[PDB]
């Protein structure tokens, strides 16, 4: 152990030793010499990086800064000791308030106690041999403080704030930033001083300083040891596996550093042959320090968020805190300054950008001015070059305020239920042909023709007629928000504009969305078809969604989305789909901005993907909004946010943009404009996105489903926990906003060969608004590494190749090099309530994997012949003597009909089937199929006799008719009647009508008659000539289709209830036909022995089966009917009820036939 002590605590003998020894190495021309070694850091630039010209050898701004410099300390230290030097390089604690530079360097000509004479002095200055002469340091007044409170110790504040962060990445950015002030302040206006990274190493005070920053590093890693956090760098692993020059170079004097030139070996410093005396700043126990820090965390905080990079110079950035001006006059209170920091840099600097935002805490001064941390204010930056020259604000991306609420805090609630109408945005596939035609007409009229209130204006809002900040004057950019936390607010508003525009032109629907998350083979016919036929005129006219003119240019310019490439099925990636993967990762996060980066750049992919190389396509930020697809596209984008937001409310965590709070108060670019530039009241009202968060309250719309994948929001929650419990590794991109729009391809390179892990797109344009992300974009590289047979920490690099959408070559330098991130996962929740929840969807929307998973379970269900097993519950339709026993004689078939209690009993049946099916290997709820909607063929699940399993397979089926009774010992065959679709353009042929009629009446029984007799239709429709089918209820239940039927049947019974809730009448109870409503069911109530289900055992009485929500714990995909929402439904039945009509009545008695 070489010893590194405090500089002030040195003994005159220790000091004499240091002096004579550093003098000794000062007269060394050899590689152990001061010149040769100081030449490692700074000018002359001997290293070469990327494909660049000669560039400074030292490494700054990267995660490798601490390793490189701790190793530089080791090299200098051993080079010292090569001339004893009994001690290692001392640290001077500059978090300790200062009056002057350490006395060792205060004055040249140090006196020996044996004087004699003089001098030397080696600590005062080290000669910059080449390019003479030496350089003293012009100190700044800021270095010396603690005098009368303010200025508060900001050096200490820097290292203490860095010491607080629990990631290596964050710690690294805050540490390097906090280490820059000494360089700057000691260096000063002199070019050649510690102030520039060109020559900062030639000054002994540099080594005395980095001794201290190293002590900070060791202190941090030690504080990480206590108690359960990694001391490993989890950032930018690629730069770890290469020799950091000139330490790996063949002429390196000492073997200890050459054998340690790899940054990978420098995570711990025990093998380096040095040690500090104390490494605890300001007389603080590690327990005291961590107490102070973890209790500095608690409460509400506010930070100046800065996005830093190499500016080719050193600079002081002063932080001014601003209070916004209401009026035209620039009266913004920027008087009071909130903070300060420093940046080291130079010419021939290594190009660099922190992958994470630098945060400078301003909470205290924000508290000083008496304005809430939550409220609106902003932060501006005064950049003074080290030259003393005041610098343009453009030099550095503008500061932001980051707000940390008191955890945990629930943001304000949404407005209760629904009333009385909201615009419903559906899946494009969920649209009936009628709806397609009507929003086609709306779009047709809005687009054709042109006005200020017309399509082209709104298409112009987003990009390239460049009206931002104002259409005047000198320099104009696109208005849309990109590379910011406010992107989805902006585009949400935009989609609302589109919505109003289409509603006023006569469309019943909100703007539909298309799930690109669902794997799709081709574009939806809605936006794919060249033309379409008007049902009335039979005239073929343009599909308004295929193309759209670009008016403001005078030529034959139309939208050309012609090229869509790289997506459609393979390569990327895919667990399900590339988009699905990206968005999954997006939905994973708790914090807003973290989610937002993933959100946005995942969405960018579909832009570049569908746009292709076409200049007037979705590829270019300029013209992408002219393409109609946009509008539907971002409907979905909006919906995505919606889902995410819902997640948060289930997570119990805040859903508003607190990560970037100041930016929420900037008025949305083209929306806040007065009446000529924007004529939409609502959107202009929400030109401040603060009220934009509430889903349906302020903006008055909602979606049909919030389901992502096939997952419910809680099912999605379960998924993200499962994914979060695995050890993952990512490749992070700092997307900086290059002028054009581009595609980058990502490669993992092990030994001698590279692997394609994925591709991401950066959306932009020539006249784009300058944009830059605060955080880094993580792309899952884990499965790559898994398929590479290469471990997490094993040696591999990343390659990118960037090419513009137009197809020209882009230098790999255009975007900062991606970095590797390691994330270890863990969760205590669940424990959750996932066992007691179910979601019921269409079998027609199901995925093949879900299909197979469904089949298997049923095979297992049908295998068991008595008690548990499907045959028993289907035999609840099966007439064994359970009708009033033990004295039961001649009667009868036990199945609750009669008919008052039909809905109840069959609810219970479908529930028994469901639980019996989940018991045997399934995690989903019993699905259904919309027979209200017209049907060409049976659902894919039942139509074929044999199906192909994952590895191939003989017919089970088991969801085929072949399901046997074993009582009569034969298969329940299902035929088809020559049916069912004759619907003209309108309206609601067959079942739908009937069902709607049923929904009309207020009374339970009056509803139930129509309801059930409507339900009989299918029993008789899939029930063919063959009596073994569903046509007769002796054998009816045994065909698995039954389950689907009286799933959907039940759903109607649920929808009705919803209506009854909306209508202000009794829903989970009834006052008609009480006698049977009071009697427990025949098969469900018999015993614990007769049926498996415990809940159907407890809930036998019809009164209890009324409330399915709380009791049976299952919700449906939707309660829509033939595309109609419940509110819409009410409007429709009232509309029918308003007309004068005759009706015919039938008195029905039960006959066996």
Numbering used by the authors: 1 to 411, 3726 to 4140, 7455 to 7781
Question: What did the original publication write about this model?
Answer:
Some animals such as molluscs and arthropods have blue blood because they utilize hemocyanin, a type-3 copper-containing protein that freely dissolves in hemolymph for oxygen transportation. Molluscan hemocyanins form decamers or multidecamers of 330–550 kDa subunits, which associate into huge cylindrical supermolecules with molecular masses varying from 3.5 to 13.5 MDa. Subunits of most molluscan hemocyanins consist of an N-terminal segment of six paralogous functional units (FUs; a-b-c-d-e-f) and a C-terminal segment with a varying number of FUs. Ten copies of the N-terminal segment (FUs a, b, c, d, e and f) thereby form a conserved cylinder wall, whereas the C-terminal segments form several inner-collar domains, located on the inner periphery of the cylinder.
Type 4 molluscan hemocyanin (squid type) is exceptional since this is the only molluscan hemocyanin type with an additional FU (FU-d*) within the N-terminal segment that usually forms the cylinder wall. Therefore, we constructed the entire structure model by rigid-body fitting. Our structure revealed a striking asymmetric inner-collar architecture and a conserved symmetric cylinder wall. 5 symmetry that is shifted towards one cylinder opening (northern hemisphere of the lumen). In TpH, the FU-gs form typical FU dimers, but in this case the dimers unusually occupy the northern and southern hemispheres of the inner space alternately [cyan FUs in Figs. 1(e) and 2(b)]. FU-d*s do not form dimers, instead single copies fill void spaces between the FU-g dimers. The segment of the wall FUs (a-b-c-d,e-f) is invariant for all ten protomers and there are two different possible conformations for each FU-g and FU-d* within a single protomer, thereby resulting in four different protomer types, namely conformers 1, 2, 3 and 4.
